[PDB]
Amino acid sequence: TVASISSGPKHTQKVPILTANETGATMPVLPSDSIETRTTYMHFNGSETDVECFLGRAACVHVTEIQNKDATGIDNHREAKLFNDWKINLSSLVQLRKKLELFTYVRFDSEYTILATASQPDSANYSSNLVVQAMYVPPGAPNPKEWDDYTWQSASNPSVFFKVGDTSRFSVPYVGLASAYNCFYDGYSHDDAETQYGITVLNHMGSMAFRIVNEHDEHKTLVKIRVYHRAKHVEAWIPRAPRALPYTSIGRTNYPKNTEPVIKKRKGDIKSY
Amino acid sequence: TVASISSGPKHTQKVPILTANETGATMPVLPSDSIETRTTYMHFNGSETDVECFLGRAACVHVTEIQNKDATGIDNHREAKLFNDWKINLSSLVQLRKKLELFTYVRFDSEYTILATASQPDSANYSSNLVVQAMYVPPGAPNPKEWDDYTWQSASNPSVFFKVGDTSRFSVPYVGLASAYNCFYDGYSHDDAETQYGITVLNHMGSMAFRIVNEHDEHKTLVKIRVYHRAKHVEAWIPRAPRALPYTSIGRTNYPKNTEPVIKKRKGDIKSY
Amino acid sequence: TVASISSGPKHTQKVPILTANETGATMPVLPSDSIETRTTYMHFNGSETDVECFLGR
Amino acid sequence: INYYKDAASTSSAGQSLSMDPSKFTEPVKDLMLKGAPALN
Amino acid sequence: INYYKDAASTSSAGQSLSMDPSKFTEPVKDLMLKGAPALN
Amino acid sequence: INYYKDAASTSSAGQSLSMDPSKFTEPVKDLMLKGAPALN
Amino acid sequence: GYSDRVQQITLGNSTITTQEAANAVVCYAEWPEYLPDVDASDVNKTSKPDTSVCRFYTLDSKTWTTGSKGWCWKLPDALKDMGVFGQNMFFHSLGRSGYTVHVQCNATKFHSGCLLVVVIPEHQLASHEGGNVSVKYTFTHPGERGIDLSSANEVGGPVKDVLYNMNGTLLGNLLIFPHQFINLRTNNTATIVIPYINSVPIDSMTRHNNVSLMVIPIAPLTVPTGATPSLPITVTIAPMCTEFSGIRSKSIVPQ
Amino acid sequence: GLPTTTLPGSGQFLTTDDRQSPSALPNYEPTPRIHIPGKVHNLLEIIQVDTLIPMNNTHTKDEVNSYLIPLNANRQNEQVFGTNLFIGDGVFKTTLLGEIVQYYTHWSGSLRFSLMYTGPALSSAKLILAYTPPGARGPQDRREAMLGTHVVWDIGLQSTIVMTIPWTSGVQFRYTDPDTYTSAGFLSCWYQTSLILPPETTGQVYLLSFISACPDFKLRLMKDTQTISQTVALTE
Amino acid sequence: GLPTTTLPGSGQFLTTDDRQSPSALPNYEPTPRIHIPGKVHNLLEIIQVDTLIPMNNTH
Amino acid sequence: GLPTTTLPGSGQFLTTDDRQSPSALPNYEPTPRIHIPGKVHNLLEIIQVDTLIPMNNTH
């Protein structure tokens, strides 16, 4: 492939460099339309800018935490982090979010990876070996209440059991209602005068539930869960302007008030170098 | 495959929507018999509603517990949870049970998975590493009595040894006396005036015995066993009405007295939306 | 493989059920030598009684 | 590839792709045609 | 070699090697030739 | 596939599917026919 | 001039005619047939009394009144005393059978009411006590009398609550079982042909009933003005393709 | 010895994975299968059989009576019943259809709603059933109702009427657990002319109503049902 | 049983590796794709569309 | 290095499984078999030989 062809002096009536940008086109002008060039080859394919590659590496999408401790006398397991759910979403952490929102609709399979590490912040004789259970409680399913509900039987709901310190990995097909995931949605769930606005009203993929299967030892053990997400088989439509201001909420486009100028001011003139 | 064909106005003597339900049939009426439709395709196969898929994921069927402790002076190992059997059955936990009882007779191979985790509720210097032995004591075999009987030699009886914290996995062929497992049985084991009624008189697959192989350390260690069961190669006959009231017993159909209305009462009229 | 063949009434001079055990043999008598039977198949091979299986765990 | 000798040890079965509701939806002795009168 | 039955379980896809910026760079109704005048 | 060189290291043997009880059930010197008299 | 409506069933030495039928149901779309060899296990030749057992027995009649809750019969129990069918039953170790069930209820064009006639394979009843109380033998072997769902709880008997099918499932879903309605305005009989359904090729006829026939009023009986407020319901049932095997001494059963 | 590397996920137990395992009972021979009528292969086979809907939900304890929709003689213009179409909740919820839908997260397809009339044979009636697609309120009078999917039913010799709720939707799947964006409409029924009883007859007559799914139907993404739970393991 | 040896790196999680995984939802059928104008395949496709430069940065 | 994943059950010992193992005595030559009357192959062969029943159990 040639990156530049050889081109010499020109004295024409045919001027490729004068255009009318009002038309909305970006005319494909090249170095050889306005200087004299020599042949050179590309030596490159643009492999690593493919959208599959761009969205295809694992990104941290969520960090939560649960603890193993005596539940005796706990009136609210959920509240003691005896167990914890995660109303699943990808808008939480901003790194991957800015990348996805370069597109309007996106479609891809997900390959999640869950790392769990334990901490024992206060005096323990040892480090116990805990098994985590991660169970996907899709919408319309019983929601745990206690850390050892009938729920956790999860006879019809996919669940994975792995050890703290290890990692669990499993992918799931693209479970969108539509043909693709909306990255934006300028609508409502119905014509209500007070119903929410935006994506949130589409993001309804349930929540992920985590718990330790082990009963309690004499000390307490903090287990912190990190969920990583990798898109595989990516398809993206309609590019948009990149995010400039900071994010404030999962699912709304809102930016913070009295934010700071995002364009760097010159130290000098327009004329400055 | 078409999900709907195109159909237009009708003014006939041939009315597919008038039927006689007294006959016991559900006549195969479609949208296109009563409105004007356009062609649309199915795009779907009904893969995930196959009975193999429906009964084919692991469900928790049993949670038991045994402990490793000094048996010195224990007059009844079984009673100290030095070891524990499980008169095998699937009626115990309700999630998988409601799923199976959608059918009258069922036939399938089982693939069991056993997770064992340890707990040390009171002061230990460390976490010991225990090996569990799970031995299938079919009917007519010597039954343990002590946690280290000659029984546990299990020279003719399949047994698996795995480590606490790990998982053991092994499947077993369909070991039913009949051609299929009865999900219900309106009979007795003989014409006795006082002999039990129901399935229980068929469920006679023995019991599973668990024990720790390790001798005792200075502290005590609680090991809690969870048995998961996955049906593979499923065959199901004669669908029945789903279970509406709560369950009270393994193997009988009995529901609790002064149960609550299972049909949700309207907040409003018959006419209400 | 048939487990039992069909067999009907008998009024013979040929009695397979009378033997002399003093001989040391176990004569291969079947249900169909003394009652009327219907055909049935074995559906079974005797796999799990092979000595390799019996001593092999 | 099966690594094991016994059939019980193989993975899940594969979709019936059988599907015939008529034993349940139309177990009538004399056939009913949609469009023809139910009771003649 | 796929070891798994479902398509979601396969690895990443392989390069589009599609690449056609004209839907974005030249969505004009009447074709523009480089070198010819923009507005006639 | 055997991964090992020695025969002792291979898995269990496979069913005789031999089966002949007559060495045990009918070791008589002169053949006995069922139906014929035992002692002539 | 054949209508779905008029029918004749002749079985043995007995015939039934209905001039107001609503087709007939054949459970699971299968018609009763004898036991094939490929499915056989017991080596015994079986006995097939044919026409002496495969005829129509009419059980004693019931009375539908505005307060009726529904009735339940078990098979082969209901027939335990009918003619030679019953003798064969007590005298062989094993037996097997399919049936033709014909439920009858006629009224006039001023009455309203609708019965559900359903056959439930393996209808294991629940104890009204809850817990794991069993349902004694006698209670699940009412004989030709059947069980009257509007009778009182008894001790060792089953629960008789209709919205729960006597087992913890809702009346509304009984329609998944082969069934037919009798709607006075349409229908006057219900006929169901039952093939033999079991997990074994042949079984005991006394320790295990393999279907319960259930007749349940759903739209209450409403008679014309100053009519007597009730109608009789009659059940006639015929064993079909019956086979008995393992003859001997004659079973003795509780009560 | 062949060199290997283990990946993330090694040793995990995923209740939904499908692999081979050693048989604990090597060489065992299962009982032969015999023939049994009634084999089910897909849950899609059974949700096409219709079952009764307790439409008359207005009682206070479960009763046979909540299956009966009453009809009054001589009323004109008025409304017989109304319900939204959240098949996973409310009237639908205990029906076989409702009960199975609850094992899955998403559904799509047409529904078949039929009404069987049980009044005396010498009576007569004309009813209108109307399906209102998502976007409008439950109709408030027949005029409103009749502008959407509807069938004038003429009560005759043929006792049942089968109305189809054709799949009307932007999004190709809806949630089985009630959700707004994903909502399916309303179903109402009104007198078209009116029920008329013959002489010597009196009182209310009832309609029975059934629901089953068209062959159109799709259910996907299995999950656990809110319809069953427990607090301690059962025992024998 | 086939003899193996594990190498350095076993058990690591590299966010950039690309391998197969079990599907948590065996047999599930995704929604059909419909056509949507605007598909992007390479970031190289979009950086050829011109956009305005805040050259007058002096504010 | 070929990528692997280990499944549930790894490391377990099931007394009934049947796999290959290294021989501790590589290259050893067992004694030749000679003929011995009486070989048994199936327990089904022997349960067809009749034996006496202590029917008179009353002692």
Ligand SMILES: COc1ccc(N2CCN(c3cccc(C)c3)CC2)nn1
């Ligand atoms: C905004 O775009 C997206 C893109 C993907 C996405 N989902 C979140 C839910 N997720 C999921 C689906 C099934 C099971 C589990 C654990 C997670 C798939 C990706 N959510 N939003």
Ligand SMILES: COc1ccc(N2CCN(c3cccc(C)c3)CC2)nn1
């Ligand atoms: C009610 O239906 C069933 C269905 C299956 C079942 N069994 C229980 C016993 N089980 C089993 C069989 C052999 C070995 C071990 C450990 C367990 C197989 C499944 N029991 N009841």
